[PDB]
Amino acid sequence: MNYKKNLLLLYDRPREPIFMGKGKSVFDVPDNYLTDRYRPIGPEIQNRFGELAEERIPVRSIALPDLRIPMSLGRQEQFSLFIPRHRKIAARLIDIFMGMRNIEELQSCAVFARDRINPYLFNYALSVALLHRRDTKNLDLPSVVEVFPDKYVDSRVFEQIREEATVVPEGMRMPIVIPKDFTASDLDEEHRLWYFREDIGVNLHHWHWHLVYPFEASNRAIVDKDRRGELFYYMHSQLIARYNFERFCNRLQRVKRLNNLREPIAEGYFPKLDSLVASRTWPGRVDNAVIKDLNRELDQIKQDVSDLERWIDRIYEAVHQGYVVDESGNRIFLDEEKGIDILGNIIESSILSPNRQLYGDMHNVGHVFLSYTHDPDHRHLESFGVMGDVATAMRDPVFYRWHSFIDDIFQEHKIKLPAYTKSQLTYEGISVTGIIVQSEGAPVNTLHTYWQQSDVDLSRGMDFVPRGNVFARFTHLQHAPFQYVIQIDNTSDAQRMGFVRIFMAPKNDERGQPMLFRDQRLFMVEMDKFLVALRPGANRIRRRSNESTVTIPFERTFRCGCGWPAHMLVPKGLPEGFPADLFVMVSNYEDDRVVQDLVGTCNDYCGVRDRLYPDRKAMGFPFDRLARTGVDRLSNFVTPNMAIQSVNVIHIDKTVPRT
Amino acid sequence: MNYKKNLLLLYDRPREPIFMGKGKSVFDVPDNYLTDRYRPIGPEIQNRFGELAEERIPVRSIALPDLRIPMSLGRQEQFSLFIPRHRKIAARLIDIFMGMRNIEELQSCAVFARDRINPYLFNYALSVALLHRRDTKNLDLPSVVEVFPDKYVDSRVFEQIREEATVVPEGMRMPIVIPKDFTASDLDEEHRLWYFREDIGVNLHHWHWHLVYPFEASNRAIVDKDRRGELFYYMHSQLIARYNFERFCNRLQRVKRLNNLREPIAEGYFPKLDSLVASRTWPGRVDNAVIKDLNRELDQIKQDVSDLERWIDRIYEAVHQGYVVDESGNRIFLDEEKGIDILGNIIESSILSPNRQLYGDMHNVGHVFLSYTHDPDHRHLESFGVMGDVATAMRDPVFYRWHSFIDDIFQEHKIKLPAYTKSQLTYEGISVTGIIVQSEGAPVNTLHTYWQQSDVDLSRGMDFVPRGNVFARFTHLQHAPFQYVIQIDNTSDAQRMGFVRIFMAPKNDERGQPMLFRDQRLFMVEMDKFLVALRPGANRIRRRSNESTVTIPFERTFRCGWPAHMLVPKGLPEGFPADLFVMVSNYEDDRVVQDYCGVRDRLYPDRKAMGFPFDRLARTGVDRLSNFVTPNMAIQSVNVIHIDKTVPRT
Ligand SMILES: [Cu+2]
Ligand SMILES: [Cu+2]
Ligand SMILES: [Cu+2]
Ligand SMILES: [Cu+2]
């Protein structure tokens, strides 16, 4: 109905009162729906903003549950799901919106609440409700860049956008260029990874992944998704694999983990963001900051570093022991199948953790510690730095160090699992004899990258700015389109089903030696995974880069287990060319199959919002475990149903248009 | 003429282009005066903003000197006079405006430049030109709070002012309350001094003092004001005396100096300001930050901490030696008269310094070091913290530590001067027999303080905001009006002229005994200094608090000296004990013929050293105030009572 489209108007101009009129519509709000500030002059307002509006949306006055808890958080405050207190507030609001039976009462509850609660919080609470109600399905939620550009853009632009919108008439407005490589100069070698850390795309993917797989609320409210623990492990694990790749393409070494929390953090990061909702800026972190015990009475944080250390010590113990203990006292075994999934819920701390109290909230609490080094006891009345918000966490270099450490803990479990036997990863009959890649106007087995400007309308997000269009020009990494061509022989006499699994890693190390398996297995980034039907004899399989099941289209972002930006699919490489091993495996789909019916949807990649995850094999399956005896490098790890290919990744420092 | 009033329109809405129309007027700018962005759509603009304007100001197209250097500083960048490079840019722009023939070209040069150079820089360069130009005298420059509220107000208000101005019609707009005590909670005991550090008044006084008495290379005529070195010493010295007073009224100890620069700085400060011109916020400083060697290639700063330490070591040496050495190699003696004045120019590094190269730029460079602890090599592309701008420097607690240190160095010279002899501070014939104070509805010898909201129109400063009024409500310390009553006997047979010098200090120490002189002399804050004619026999002198020569009225500081509402320390609810002191000196000796306090435009009207009775050590035998006194002086126990209530302005 219309109602579905009318809720989307709530996302429009989050800080402009709801009675000011969104898009080509305006709400006809009751007077008991007006805020205390504006209620005493309600007559003057409804009339004043009624003009220039095509439609007028009525709103029925209903009960509305107690909104004390939702309103506890200040309006000009920041909102993060990592902070214990905010979790209880959001989970309560989510509960209200979720608990409105009708799509009409949801509209009424929303319209009332919207101008009383924290915009960032409202956006989250609504987003979660809409995505996981039955009546509001297939609903295309506006990009959070468009509603909250302050979390994605250098603060400098805002006073330019205000100038441009006030001075120049619509239609003649110049696109505002968004600064790139702006957080640090060349004295900081970390500044080279701007195109990854600070890319709009990857930050959106991270935010959205945490939307669809929360770790707190209600198991029926989306917490208990199939293998979300393993997902949490793998997704984040692939972030670092991809990061480590991009590091090698900028003459840097692999990211060093956060060994121990008492030693200083070498790499500081000033993010250059200004929250228009908090009206403040995000604090920076200085070089050689040290983690400090937190006492944030307001936020309900009373945590010592030793608490974190204690959780880690215990988790390590469990992993080595090979089992965990639940609240009840029973033992649950970290087996080949569900081990990783369990560990994930334990480490992140999802209410699915079999004993939160013992093994703690290790990952999340780490994010808070790292974000509050500048003001840990709240004496300076400062908010958390960028690592304290999922929306912005990936911008900071320390993210990759903390997430690197966490990964090592997971690894400690994976190296206990028994090696995949020759048998287990052979497909009797099937043989892959070669794989190549071809780009238009470029040699075989060669990928190209470059810079590319794209445009985004930030108009809906610019509160109290003269209406009209406000286009911003993002510069971001892009790759030339390509396609894989895979030669597979059947030699069986029957149609064989198979999973095509495509990963890509560096060929050599940082020192220039052909990489060993033990090393290289952890640097393989998934590139595609799709089902294929093979006829007897010979089969030529062709697959486009844009068909990738790891990726989501351009259109979705601007307009894994969840959608990685398409333009970030290929590592940057070097101008002189960066050598890389392309790997493909065809596994026996009959074993890997997960009997299930789905057409799929994602964040709103096929989707996988349907109960189960469509692959019985472990995530990162060929390379998640150690090598079997005798294996030493990729070229002797291979079975017949696998193939390797030398690829060369060439960057070109030029800015192509979008066409 | 009109021209004088037309320049004042440049101060209106600094970031709104000059062709958008200021007040009830608009400028008719040439097309070669437009900016490159807006030039190609000139046809659409001049017409679009021509409407709703009563007057239209024409502007003649002139040659215009090269504006390369002025334009070198980015538009979205911060501007500080402490940074070496900015000094050279501003001094060059000042030079351009200053060099324009008529006030028809001053207006033309200005109108062109305004939208090409950094607003903060423009404001400074213009302010300086107008204040010291030939045709432009007695011109009332708009308060810098009204043009740049971002340097004086929590950033939180800005999005409220934008909301209020867009939603609510004029006339029905609610005044925006400005948050007070907002930079730190009660876990930080320093937060108590918000009413002084963060008070609009005192921050304006500091900014303005540096306007009228620069040290900047600039030109020697502008910088060389009578005894500006001693002024620099005394004014800043009184800031800390007053600060130390306010500390005692908040159950704190005296401010500790910055002993040595290698040790951490305990007190951090996040100022909560957001520069709308830079579109960023000012960085904070964390607890236990350490000073670090600066390498800001862009700003032209290559200074090591050891450089600073070397300057200090040398300055100390000179002070103890008793003389300095000029560039030429000659020796100049730090005598009783001009010693302090010299030292001032040496320490701040004013171009008047007899040897900048040797004794350095000690005070100023310190401000930069302290403001860049968070990003000293520019690797993080961050700007300076609050201590890097005179406009905001007093907000940070470290200001008082750094300025406390500097004062100790001056003191090291003052303790070398010979004690004032009984003779030197006696007035033969004159005897002061008593001084008292009286407030309406309050016992004798009792001062009261409290909080008071006042209103300021920040409308001129709110760029790209719907036109109308935008009143902001400041909460600030205030004192009940009072008056001194002084009983003076002549016993001479002739009319005697005299200077009345009134200071106030704390009465007792940490242990609850009468403070000793050595201690107390440094805590005396000047309260008034005025000329009086005494008839033979007995004289009853009466002086109102609002007549103070240390102070200037409310009206000036909201539209220059020390804010009037800050004249009296806060005191305690239970009452704070204080010694009120008055001295009558022989005006004939003190006279400086001639046809106040810190800022006097003319030569300084007092031959005596600034601080006079207490600048030097005690003569032998003297031990406390009550035996320092001569007949022509008087002491009085005063009690300062605070009341935590908010009175209106009426
Ligand atoms: Cu995450
Ligand atoms: Cu994380
Ligand atoms: Cu100063
Ligand atoms: Cu200073």
Distances (CA, A) of B551 to A108, B433, B557, B562: 58, 27, 11, 5
- B159–A375 C-beta distance less than 8 A: no
- Residue B589 DSSP SS3: helix
Q: Judging by DSSP bridges, how do beta strands A551-552 and A564-565 pair with one another?
A: parallel
Per the listing, tokens 């004993």 go with: A355
**Residue A320 assigned as binding residue:** no
Breaks in chain B after (C-N > 2.5 angstroms): 559, 595
- For B185, the closest of A44, A283, A378 (CB atoms) is A378
CA–CA distance, B126 with B2 (Å, rounded to integer)? 17
Q: Are A528 and A500 in contact (CB under 8 A)?
A: yes
- A45–B155 C-beta distance less than 8 A: no
| Residue to test with chain A: of B269, B286, B463, B465, most A Cβ within 10 A | B286
Identity of the amino acid at A358: L
* Tokens encoding B99: 């060099």
Q: Are B452 and B480 in contact (CB under 8 A)?
A: no
CA–CA distance, A254 with A523 (Å, rounded to integer)? 10
CA–CA distance, B407 with B362 (Å, rounded to integer)? 12
Helix (H) / strand (E) containing B483:
strand B482-489
CA–CA distance, A193 with A181 (Å, rounded to integer)? 8
* Tokens encoding B511: 């242990």
Identity of the amino acid at A304: D
- Residue A562 DSSP SS3: coil
- Residue B61 DSSP SS3: coil
- Residue A185 DSSP SS3: coil
- Residue B251: exposed, middle, or buried by beta-carbon count in 10 A (0-12, 13-18, 19+)? exposed
Q: What residues in B contact A464, CB-CB < 8 Å?
A: 159, 162-163, 166
* Tokens encoding A545: 């880069």
Helix (H) / strand (E) containing B113:
helix B103-113
Span from the CA of A206 to the centroid of ligand 1 (angstroms): 6
CA–CA distance, A587 with A615 (Å, rounded to integer)? 11
**Residue A206 assigned as binding residue:** yes
A116, A118, A122, A124: CA torsion to nearest 10: -170
Binding annotation of B: 206, 210, 236, 363, 367, 403
Residues 6+ apart with CB under 8 A from A177: A453, A472, A473, A475
Q: Are A448 and A378 in contact (CB under 8 A)?
A: no
- β-partners of residue B229 are none
Whole-angstrom distance between the N-terminal and C-terminal Cα of chain A? Answer: 35
- A286–B289 C-beta distance less than 8 A: yes
Span from the CA of A94 to the centroid of ligand 2 (angstroms): 22
Number of Cβ within 10 Å of residue A442's Cβ equals: 14
Q: What residues in A contact B16, CB-CB < 8 Å?
A: 166
* Tokens encoding B471: 């009143």
Residues 6+ apart with CB under 8 A from B435: B484, B485, B486, B487, B502, B580, B582, B634, B636
Number of Cβ within 10 Å of residue A480's Cβ equals: 18
DSSP character for A282? P
Span from the CA of A390 to the centroid of ligand 1 (angstroms): 6
Helix (H) / strand (E) containing A177:
strand A176-177
DSSP character for B250? T
CA–CA distance, A234 with A408 (Å, rounded to integer)? 12
Share in percent of chain B as helix, strand, coil (round to 5): 35, 20, 45
| Residue to test with chain A: of B159, B295, B296, most A Cβ within 10 A | B159
- Residue A415 DSSP SS3: coil
- Residue B179: exposed, middle, or buried by beta-carbon count in 10 A (0-12, 13-18, 19+)? middle
- For B274, the closest of A187, A281, A381 (CB atoms) is A281
- β-partners of residue A525 are A504
Sheet with A483-489: strands ordered across:
A431-438, A483-489, A538-544
**In this structure, which ligand is nearest to the CA of B347?**
4
Distances (CA, A) of B223 to B99, B229, B344, B605: 17, 10, 13, 19
CA–CA distance, B146 with B22 (Å, rounded to integer)? 14
CA–CA distance, A327 with A357 (Å, rounded to integer)? 8
CA–CA distance, A391 with A151 (Å, rounded to integer)? 7
CA–CA distance, A610 with A601 (Å, rounded to integer)? 8
Q: What angle do CA A496, A499, A503 make, to 5 degrees?
A: 145
Q: Are A431 and A586 in contact (CB under 8 A)?
A: no
- Backbone torsions φ then ψ of B353, nearest 5 degrees: -55, 130
- Backbone torsions φ then ψ of B643, nearest 5 degrees: -135, 120
Please count the residues of chain B: 650
Per the listing, tokens 């009558």 go with: B584
User: What resolution does the deposited structure have, in angstroms?
Assistant: 3.2
Q: What angle do CA A346, A352, A357 make, to 5 degrees?
A: 55
List residues of A with catalytic annotation: 348
- Backbone torsions φ then ψ of B101, nearest 5 degrees: -35, -70
Q: What residues in A contact B183, CB-CB < 8 Å?
A: 380-381
Residue whose C-alpha is closest to residue B152's, from B127, B129, B178: B178
Distances (CA, A) of A530 to A526, A533, A562, A602: 12, 10, 15, 17
Q: Judging by DSSP bridges, how do beta strands A176-177 and A471-479 pair with one another?
A: parallel
Identity of the amino acid at A307: D
Number of Cβ within 10 Å of residue B14's Cβ equals: 20
CA–CA distance, A102 with A105 (Å, rounded to integer)? 5
- Backbone torsions φ then ψ of B356, nearest 5 degrees: -55, -40
* Tokens encoding A389: 């918000």
Residue whose C-alpha is closest to residue A375's, from A266, A260, A284: A284
Identity of the amino acid at B76: Q
Per the listing, tokens 């730090």 go with: B334
The catalytic residue among B263, B348, B440, B526 is B348
Number of Cβ within 10 Å of residue A255's Cβ equals: 18
Residue whose C-alpha is closest to residue A153's, from A201, A197, A200: A200
Q: What residues in A contact B15, CB-CB < 8 Å?
A: 159, 163
Residues 6+ apart with CB under 8 A from B443: none
Q: Are A311 and A359 in contact (CB under 8 A)?
A: yes
H helix runs in A49-100, sequence order: 68-72, 84-98
Helix (H) / strand (E) containing B627:
helix B625-628
- A41–B378 C-beta distance less than 8 A: no
